[PDB]
Amino acid sequence: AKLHDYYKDEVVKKLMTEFNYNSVMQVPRVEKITLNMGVGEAIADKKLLDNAAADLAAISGQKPLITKARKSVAGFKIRQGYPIGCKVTLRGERMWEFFERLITIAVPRIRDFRGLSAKSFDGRGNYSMGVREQIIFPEIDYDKVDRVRGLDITITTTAKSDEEGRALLAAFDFPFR
Amino acid sequence: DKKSARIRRATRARRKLQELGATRLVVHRTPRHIYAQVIAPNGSEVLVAASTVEKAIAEQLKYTGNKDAAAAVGKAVAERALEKGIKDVSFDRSGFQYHGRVQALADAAREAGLQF
Amino acid sequence: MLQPKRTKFRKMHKGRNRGLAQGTDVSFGSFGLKAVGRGRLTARQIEAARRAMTRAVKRQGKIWIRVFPDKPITEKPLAVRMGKGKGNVEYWVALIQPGKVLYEMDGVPEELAREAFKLAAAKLPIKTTFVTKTVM
Amino acid sequence: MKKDIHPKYEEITASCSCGNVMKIRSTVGHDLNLDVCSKCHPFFTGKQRDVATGGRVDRFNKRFNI
Amino acid sequence: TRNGRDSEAKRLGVKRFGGESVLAGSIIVRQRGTKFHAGANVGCGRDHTLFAKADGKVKFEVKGPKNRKFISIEAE
Amino acid sequence: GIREKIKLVSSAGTGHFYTTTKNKRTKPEKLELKKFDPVVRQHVIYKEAKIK
RNA sequence: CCGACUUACCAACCCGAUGCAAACUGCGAAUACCGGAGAAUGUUAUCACGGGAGACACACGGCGGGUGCUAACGUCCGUC
RNA sequence: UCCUCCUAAAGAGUAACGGAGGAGCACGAAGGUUGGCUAAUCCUGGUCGGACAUCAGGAGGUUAGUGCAAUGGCAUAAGCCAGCUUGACUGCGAGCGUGACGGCGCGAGCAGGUGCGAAAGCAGGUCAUAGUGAUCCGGUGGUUCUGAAUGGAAGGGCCAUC
RNA sequence: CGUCGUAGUCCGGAUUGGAGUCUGCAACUCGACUCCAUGAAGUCGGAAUCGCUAGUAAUCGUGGAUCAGAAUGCCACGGUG
RNA sequence: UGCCUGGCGGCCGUAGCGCGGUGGUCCCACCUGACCCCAUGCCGAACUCAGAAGUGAAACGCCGUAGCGCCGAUGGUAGUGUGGGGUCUCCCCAUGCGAGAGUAGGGAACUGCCAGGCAU
RNA sequence: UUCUUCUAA
RNA sequence: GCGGGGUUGAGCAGCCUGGUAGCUCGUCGGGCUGAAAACCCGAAGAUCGUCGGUUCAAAUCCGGCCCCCGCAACCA
Ligand SMILES: [Mg+2]
Ligand SMILES: [Mg+2]
Ligand SMILES: [Mg+2]
Ligand SMILES: [Mg+2]
Ligand SMILES: [Mg+2]
Ligand SMILES: [Mg+2]
Ligand SMILES: [Mg+2]
Ligand SMILES: [Mg+2]
Ligand SMILES: [Mg+2]
Ligand SMILES: [Mg+2]
Ligand SMILES: [Mg+2]
Ligand SMILES: [Mg+2]
Ligand SMILES: [Mg+2]
Ligand SMILES: [Mg+2]
Ligand SMILES: [Mg+2]
Ligand SMILES: [Mg+2]
Ligand SMILES: [Mg+2]
Ligand SMILES: [Mg+2]
Ligand SMILES: [Mg+2]
Ligand SMILES: [Mg+2]
Ligand SMILES: [Mg+2]
Ligand SMILES: [Mg+2]
Ligand SMILES: [Mg+2]
Ligand SMILES: [Mg+2]
Ligand SMILES: [Mg+2]
Ligand SMILES: [Mg+2]
Ligand SMILES: [Mg+2]
Ligand SMILES: [Mg+2]
Ligand SMILES: [Mg+2]
Ligand SMILES: [Mg+2]
Ligand SMILES: [Mg+2]
Ligand SMILES: [Mg+2]
Ligand SMILES: [Mg+2]
Ligand SMILES: [Mg+2]
Ligand SMILES: [Mg+2]
Ligand SMILES: [Mg+2]
Ligand SMILES: [Mg+2]
Ligand SMILES: [Zn+2]
Structure with missing residues (x-):
C-alpha cells in the first residue's frame, strides 16, 4: 500500500489541478489488475496448465482461477468446458504491492526494454500490456523452470476518457516512452 | 445496478406471498439504517x-x-404488531441474505411475539 | 429471369388473387406502367417486357421493376395420373392485382415513355395503362 | 482472502546495484539481490543514445581531408 | 412421396370462457406453454393446464408490466 | 435401448421393491436410495438388485 | 517489407424509399362458438333410460379451400 | 403406430398417394429444494494467439439458452452455477378434459412417512407436447385369501413384477 | 604442462554486419588478407562407389610454376608411419 | 398542510429512452475498515460485518427539452353477416358490422398507504 | 536361380 | 420409377456412425549399364462428384442435383 499511500496524497493533488474536477470522487483511480495466462496448449495435458497456474501463483500470491472455454471452436480443437487458461484478479492492498513490484522490478528486468505503448488504452482508459517471458519477475527461479510462459497484465481503472488513464499511470511514472 | 438486481432477487418470493394472501413483514436494509413494516x-x-x-x-x-440496532427494530415492530392484534405474518427478506442484521431482526421478531 | 435465390419452402398453395393492389403511386421514376387487369406475370413475361422497353429507350434513362416473381408454380408432367404427390416446380409468377405499378421509368421524354411502355405492354397478358408521377 | 489455498506472501528486502534498498511483500521467502531497478535503469538516459543512426556524409568527411 | 404423416389433434384451447361458473378442479384452459397465466384461486398444472382451485366465475384479465394474460376465479 | 432396468429391494426385511432403470455401462456402481417402504411405513434405504 | 494510388467492379451492416408470404406477425375484423339475463313464440321442440332399426357407395349447386391447368358432370375436406 | 407445423375457413374437430420435419430415447442427476447468477453477436486493447481459445472495457438486449424435431412457452426465468438431498414417496382423491369403447390426461385436498428451507412454503420426476403394445399363456418375489374326506401340499386368487 | 569433460559443446566454421590493410589507373558487379562481432548445416553419411602391397596408404607441414594482386587446383619436398 | 426523501403497491410505455440542468441538514448512493459473523470454483468486486473521514463524480431522484419510442381521432378504404344481382378465376346492390396502415393531434405519466426530514 | 534389347554410312 | 457408385495421373481400398487419406501401377530424383530395359535407393502429390443443411467441426450425417452402372417398365 506504499503506492496507495503515494496515490492518496500526491497523485490526487496532481490530477485535480490538471483536469479541474469539481469533486475529489471525480478523479480516476485504479480498480483491479487482471493476470491472464491464455494457455491454449494445455489441451494436450493438464500438467502444463497445472504448472503455469503454479507459476502465476508465484508472481501474484493468489491461487489462480482456472478459466474454461466459453464455447466450442474447431479451429483450436477445443470444446466448451475445457480448462484453457488461468486468471488472477488483484484488488485492494494486493493490487498495489504487485503494482509496486511490477513497475520497479519486473519492467526493468525486461530484456531490451525500451518503453511501453501509449496506444494500449482500449478507448476507455483501461490499460493492457503483455509480457513475453515470466523470468522478468524475480519470483521465478531460473534453474527450477523449464518452459517460457507468457502472461498479460490488464489494469482496469475508473478513468472515463482515454487520456485520463494515460495521465493516471504517468503520475505513477509508468514507463510509456 | 445493485439496487435493480436486489429487486429481481426479491421479486419471486414477493409474488409467492402475494397469492398466498399472507400479511407480510418487509425488512429493508441500508448501510446506515434498517427498516421494518x-x-x-x-x-x-x-x-x-x-x-x-x-x-x-x-x-x-x-x-x-x-x-x-437491527434487533431493536424487530423487537419494536413486533410489540406494535401485537398491540394491533397482528400475530401471524410471513417474513419477506426482500432480496437480502437471511443473515446478519436481517437475521437479527427476524430472530428478535420471533422472540418478541410474532409468529412465522 | 427473375427468381428468388433462396426460398423458405419449395412449393406453395395456389391461393387466390382477389383484392386491390398496393404499389399504386409512381414511387421512384417519373413515368409508370400500371396494371388495370388481374392475373399473374411469369418470370419470362417480366423479362421479355423489360427487354422490349430497354431497346426502345436505347439504354437511356433508368428502369425499375416494381414486381418480382416469388410464387413457385408446379406442373405435373404429361401422362401422369392425378395422385402421387404435388407436381414439380416449373416456373415463377408474381400475382398482380388492379392498380399495381409494373414498371417505372425516367430520364426519357414523355413521348418516348409512351412508345416504350406500349411496346412492353404487348408482351404482357394483363391490360395495362400509362401513369405519371402525381404530386402528393 | 481464503485461508489455505494461497501461497506464502511475506515481506522481504530487495537491494540493487545502485543501493536502492526497497522492502516489498513477496512470495520469494529468501532475501533478494537485484540488478537494475526503476531508479537505476537506463531508460531515461541510456535508451536515448541507443538509437545511433549516424550520418553518411559525416562518415565520409572524417576519413580524410581534401 | 414423403409427406404422409401428421399427429393427432391434442384438443387444446379454452374450455370455460369468462363469466362462467365452475366447480373447484375444473379445467379452464389447456395449452402448450403459459400462453395464459394463473391468477387468483387458479392453479397451473404439470403440462401448464389452468384449473380452478375454488368455486366461482372465470375472470380473464391482463396484468403486470409485460401485459401477460391472467385467469382468476372470482368468488361467488 | 442400452438403459437396462433393475429393481430396488428394501433393506427392511420385507420383499417390497421399487423398479427402475439405469445405464449399467456408465454407472457400474450400485444404486442406493432411501425410499418409503409401505409395509413397514418408514423410509428405509433400498439397494439395487437384479430384476431377474 | 510497407504498400502506392484509381475503377463503366462487387458488396455486409446501417439509413431512406418500395413490394411479397399456407407453414411471417410489433396489428386485427365480420361471423361463428361458450356462458349469463330477459321477453315473445313453438303440439317438449330438450335430456335421461329402455324396445326395434336402417345406414357407414352419396350426388350436384352456393360459399371457404387443398389437389389439378382457379381443366373436367375431376378429386379431397369445411359449411349450407 | 406416435409427435410438431400448415392445409383447418379467428372455440373443438376436419380429408387427399396434400406441403414440411421428427420419435421407438436419455438422465441416480439432466430429479427435489435452498441460495446465487444472466445470454448471442460485434468493437476496441492485450504474450505465444492466428477468422476464431483465454483476459480487460463497450455496444447490444435474448437475435442466446432448453439432452433431441417443430410449435407454444420461458427473466419471478422453465436458461446457468453451487450446497444439502431422494417427493423419480405409498394409500387416496373432490372436480373436470378427452375419446364409440378399451383407454389416455389434468388435479386442489386428505392420511402416512420424508427432503430442502430460518420461515412462508415447495417436492407424487424432468418447459410442455413423441420415446410405444391390449388380452391370453408363462416366469419371479410377496401374501394362509383358497386348499375336492381331514391335516398339509400342489394348483389357483390377490399385490408387486418380468 | 595446464585446460575443457560429451553437450551442437571452449566441437564445427558457414553466413552476415562493422572496421581495415595491401595490390592495382581502378577492387560495385568481381580480388586477397586482417580485426571485432555473428556462430548455419553437420553428431560419420541410402543404393552405390574409389584409392592403395612399404617408406606404400593414412596424416603433417614446406616450396615452386603461372602471377601487379588473386588457390582448397597443379607440380615438387621432407616428417611421422 | 406544503416541500423533499425512503419503503410498499396500484397502473403497465401519454408511464420508455435520449439531451440539457440540479440536489446532499436529513435520507440515499458511492464511500472507510475488516482479526472476527459471513464470503470469493482467484479476488471484502459481489455477498457480509464493523463504521462515518470524504463526495454527490457515478448511480439515483427531480426539473427542462419533441431526437425518438409510445398514444391517436375524424373521414375514407379493405374485409365481411344476411338478402339480391352480373360480364361469375372476380366484382356489384340493399342492409348491418367495420379494420389495419396513414393524417390532424396528444404526449417529458398518474395515484394510494406508511415513515423520515425541513418549513409552516 | 533368373538375367532382354540396340537403329545411322 | 427403384437400387448402387463418384476417393492422388490410372485402378481400387478407407467411406461407419463426425475430429485420422491408403495401396498398386504411373511420375520425379539418384544408382547400376557402353546405352536403353529390368532391378536398387530416396521421393512427392487428393477442394474425397456437385449443391444446400446439421453441427464446435462433414470425404463421412441429412436433403436436393449431376454423371455412371444395375433392376423394372407388365395385364388387355
Ligand atoms: Mg385464402
Ligand atoms: Mg396468415
Ligand atoms: Mg365401410
Ligand atoms: Mg364412405
Ligand atoms: Mg366418398
Ligand atoms: Mg363426401
Ligand atoms: Mg369450391
Ligand atoms: Mg377444387
Ligand atoms: Mg364429382
Ligand atoms: Mg370443379
Ligand atoms: Mg360442398
Ligand atoms: Mg381451429
Ligand atoms: Mg371456425
Ligand atoms: Mg432440464
Ligand atoms: Mg432459484
Ligand atoms: Mg430442473
Ligand atoms: Mg422437454
Ligand atoms: Mg392369443
Ligand atoms: Mg385336503
Ligand atoms: Mg385353511
Ligand atoms: Mg383328496
Ligand atoms: Mg589437451
Ligand atoms: Mg571453435
Ligand atoms: Mg542440427
Ligand atoms: Mg558430439
Ligand atoms: Mg603393385
Ligand atoms: Mg602470386
Ligand atoms: Mg441525464
Ligand atoms: Mg462496500
Ligand atoms: Mg451527478
Ligand atoms: Mg373510422
Ligand atoms: Mg385506425
Ligand atoms: Mg416520455
Ligand atoms: Mg425525461
Ligand atoms: Mg524391341
Ligand atoms: Mg532402364
Ligand atoms: Mg474429412
Ligand atoms: Zn537499482
Whole structure:
C-alpha cells in the first residue's frame, strides 16, 4: 500500500489541478489488475496448465482461477468446458504491492526494454500490456523452470476518457516512452 | 445496478406471498439504517412500522446500522404488531441474505411475539 | 429471369388473387406502367417486357421493376395420373392485382415513355395503362 | 482472502546495484539481490543514445581531408 | 412421396370462457406453454393446464408490466 | 435401448421393491436410495438388485 | 517489407424509399362458438333410460379451400 | 403406430398417394429444494494467439439458452452455477378434459412417512407436447385369501413384477 | 604442462554486419588478407562407389610454376608411419 | 398542510429512452475498515460485518427539452353477416358490422398507504 | 536361380 | 420409377456412425549399364462428384442435383 499511500496524497493533488474536477470522487483511480495466462496448449495435458497456474501463483500470491472455454471452436480443437487458461484478479492492498513490484522490478528486468505503448488504452482508459517471458519477475527461479510462459497484465481503472488513464499511470511514472 | 438486481432477487418470493394472501413483514436494509413494516395482503397499505430513522428508537442505540440496532427494530415492530392484534405474518427478506442484521431482526421478531 | 435465390419452402398453395393492389403511386421514376387487369406475370413475361422497353429507350434513362416473381408454380408432367404427390416446380409468377405499378421509368421524354411502355405492354397478358408521377 | 489455498506472501528486502534498498511483500521467502531497478535503469538516459543512426556524409568527411 | 404423416389433434384451447361458473378442479384452459397465466384461486398444472382451485366465475384479465394474460376465479 | 432396468429391494426385511432403470455401462456402481417402504411405513434405504 | 494510388467492379451492416408470404406477425375484423339475463313464440321442440332399426357407395349447386391447368358432370375436406 | 407445423375457413374437430420435419430415447442427476447468477453477436486493447481459445472495457438486449424435431412457452426465468438431498414417496382423491369403447390426461385436498428451507412454503420426476403394445399363456418375489374326506401340499386368487 | 569433460559443446566454421590493410589507373558487379562481432548445416553419411602391397596408404607441414594482386587446383619436398 | 426523501403497491410505455440542468441538514448512493459473523470454483468486486473521514463524480431522484419510442381521432378504404344481382378465376346492390396502415393531434405519466426530514 | 534389347554410312 | 457408385495421373481400398487419406501401377530424383530395359535407393502429390443443411467441426450425417452402372417398365 506504499503506492496507495503515494496515490492518496500526491497523485490526487496532481490530477485535480490538471483536469479541474469539481469533486475529489471525480478523479480516476485504479480498480483491479487482471493476470491472464491464455494457455491454449494445455489441451494436450493438464500438467502444463497445472504448472503455469503454479507459476502465476508465484508472481501474484493468489491461487489462480482456472478459466474454461466459453464455447466450442474447431479451429483450436477445443470444446466448451475445457480448462484453457488461468486468471488472477488483484484488488485492494494486493493490487498495489504487485503494482509496486511490477513497475520497479519486473519492467526493468525486461530484456531490451525500451518503453511501453501509449496506444494500449482500449478507448476507455483501461490499460493492457503483455509480457513475453515470466523470468522478468524475480519470483521465478531460473534453474527450477523449464518452459517460457507468457502472461498479460490488464489494469482496469475508473478513468472515463482515454487520456485520463494515460495521465493516471504517468503520475505513477509508468514507463510509456 | 445493485439496487435493480436486489429487486429481481426479491421479486419471486414477493409474488409467492402475494397469492398466498399472507400479511407480510418487509425488512429493508441500508448501510446506515434498517427498516421494518408489516403490509396488508392487498400490498397497498401497512399496519405497523418501525425503523432506526425514528427518534424514539434510534436514541436508545449506539449506531443505527449494526445488529443490536437491527434487533431493536424487530423487537419494536413486533410489540406494535401485537398491540394491533397482528400475530401471524410471513417474513419477506426482500432480496437480502437471511443473515446478519436481517437475521437479527427476524430472530428478535420471533422472540418478541410474532409468529412465522 | 427473375427468381428468388433462396426460398423458405419449395412449393406453395395456389391461393387466390382477389383484392386491390398496393404499389399504386409512381414511387421512384417519373413515368409508370400500371396494371388495370388481374392475373399473374411469369418470370419470362417480366423479362421479355423489360427487354422490349430497354431497346426502345436505347439504354437511356433508368428502369425499375416494381414486381418480382416469388410464387413457385408446379406442373405435373404429361401422362401422369392425378395422385402421387404435388407436381414439380416449373416456373415463377408474381400475382398482380388492379392498380399495381409494373414498371417505372425516367430520364426519357414523355413521348418516348409512351412508345416504350406500349411496346412492353404487348408482351404482357394483363391490360395495362400509362401513369405519371402525381404530386402528393 | 481464503485461508489455505494461497501461497506464502511475506515481506522481504530487495537491494540493487545502485543501493536502492526497497522492502516489498513477496512470495520469494529468501532475501533478494537485484540488478537494475526503476531508479537505476537506463531508460531515461541510456535508451536515448541507443538509437545511433549516424550520418553518411559525416562518415565520409572524417576519413580524410581534401 | 414423403409427406404422409401428421399427429393427432391434442384438443387444446379454452374450455370455460369468462363469466362462467365452475366447480373447484375444473379445467379452464389447456395449452402448450403459459400462453395464459394463473391468477387468483387458479392453479397451473404439470403440462401448464389452468384449473380452478375454488368455486366461482372465470375472470380473464391482463396484468403486470409485460401485459401477460391472467385467469382468476372470482368468488361467488 | 442400452438403459437396462433393475429393481430396488428394501433393506427392511420385507420383499417390497421399487423398479427402475439405469445405464449399467456408465454407472457400474450400485444404486442406493432411501425410499418409503409401505409395509413397514418408514423410509428405509433400498439397494439395487437384479430384476431377474 | 510497407504498400502506392484509381475503377463503366462487387458488396455486409446501417439509413431512406418500395413490394411479397399456407407453414411471417410489433396489428386485427365480420361471423361463428361458450356462458349469463330477459321477453315473445313453438303440439317438449330438450335430456335421461329402455324396445326395434336402417345406414357407414352419396350426388350436384352456393360459399371457404387443398389437389389439378382457379381443366373436367375431376378429386379431397369445411359449411349450407 | 406416435409427435410438431400448415392445409383447418379467428372455440373443438376436419380429408387427399396434400406441403414440411421428427420419435421407438436419455438422465441416480439432466430429479427435489435452498441460495446465487444472466445470454448471442460485434468493437476496441492485450504474450505465444492466428477468422476464431483465454483476459480487460463497450455496444447490444435474448437475435442466446432448453439432452433431441417443430410449435407454444420461458427473466419471478422453465436458461446457468453451487450446497444439502431422494417427493423419480405409498394409500387416496373432490372436480373436470378427452375419446364409440378399451383407454389416455389434468388435479386442489386428505392420511402416512420424508427432503430442502430460518420461515412462508415447495417436492407424487424432468418447459410442455413423441420415446410405444391390449388380452391370453408363462416366469419371479410377496401374501394362509383358497386348499375336492381331514391335516398339509400342489394348483389357483390377490399385490408387486418380468 | 595446464585446460575443457560429451553437450551442437571452449566441437564445427558457414553466413552476415562493422572496421581495415595491401595490390592495382581502378577492387560495385568481381580480388586477397586482417580485426571485432555473428556462430548455419553437420553428431560419420541410402543404393552405390574409389584409392592403395612399404617408406606404400593414412596424416603433417614446406616450396615452386603461372602471377601487379588473386588457390582448397597443379607440380615438387621432407616428417611421422 | 406544503416541500423533499425512503419503503410498499396500484397502473403497465401519454408511464420508455435520449439531451440539457440540479440536489446532499436529513435520507440515499458511492464511500472507510475488516482479526472476527459471513464470503470469493482467484479476488471484502459481489455477498457480509464493523463504521462515518470524504463526495454527490457515478448511480439515483427531480426539473427542462419533441431526437425518438409510445398514444391517436375524424373521414375514407379493405374485409365481411344476411338478402339480391352480373360480364361469375372476380366484382356489384340493399342492409348491418367495420379494420389495419396513414393524417390532424396528444404526449417529458398518474395515484394510494406508511415513515423520515425541513418549513409552516 | 533368373538375367532382354540396340537403329545411322 | 427403384437400387448402387463418384476417393492422388490410372485402378481400387478407407467411406461407419463426425475430429485420422491408403495401396498398386504411373511420375520425379539418384544408382547400376557402353546405352536403353529390368532391378536398387530416396521421393512427392487428393477442394474425397456437385449443391444446400446439421453441427464446435462433414470425404463421412441429412436433403436436393449431376454423371455412371444395375433392376423394372407388365395385364388387355
Ligand atoms: Mg385464402
Ligand atoms: Mg396468415
Ligand atoms: Mg365401410
Ligand atoms: Mg364412405
Ligand atoms: Mg366418398
Ligand atoms: Mg363426401
Ligand atoms: Mg369450391
Ligand atoms: Mg377444387
Ligand atoms: Mg364429382
Ligand atoms: Mg370443379
Ligand atoms: Mg360442398
Ligand atoms: Mg381451429
Ligand atoms: Mg371456425
Ligand atoms: Mg432440464
Ligand atoms: Mg432459484
Ligand atoms: Mg430442473
Ligand atoms: Mg422437454
Ligand atoms: Mg392369443
Ligand atoms: Mg385336503
Ligand atoms: Mg385353511
Ligand atoms: Mg383328496
Ligand atoms: Mg589437451
Ligand atoms: Mg571453435
Ligand atoms: Mg542440427
Ligand atoms: Mg558430439
Ligand atoms: Mg603393385
Ligand atoms: Mg602470386
Ligand atoms: Mg441525464
Ligand atoms: Mg462496500
Ligand atoms: Mg451527478
Ligand atoms: Mg373510422
Ligand atoms: Mg385506425
Ligand atoms: Mg416520455
Ligand atoms: Mg425525461
Ligand atoms: Mg524391341
Ligand atoms: Mg532402364
Ligand atoms: Mg474429412
Ligand atoms: Zn537499482
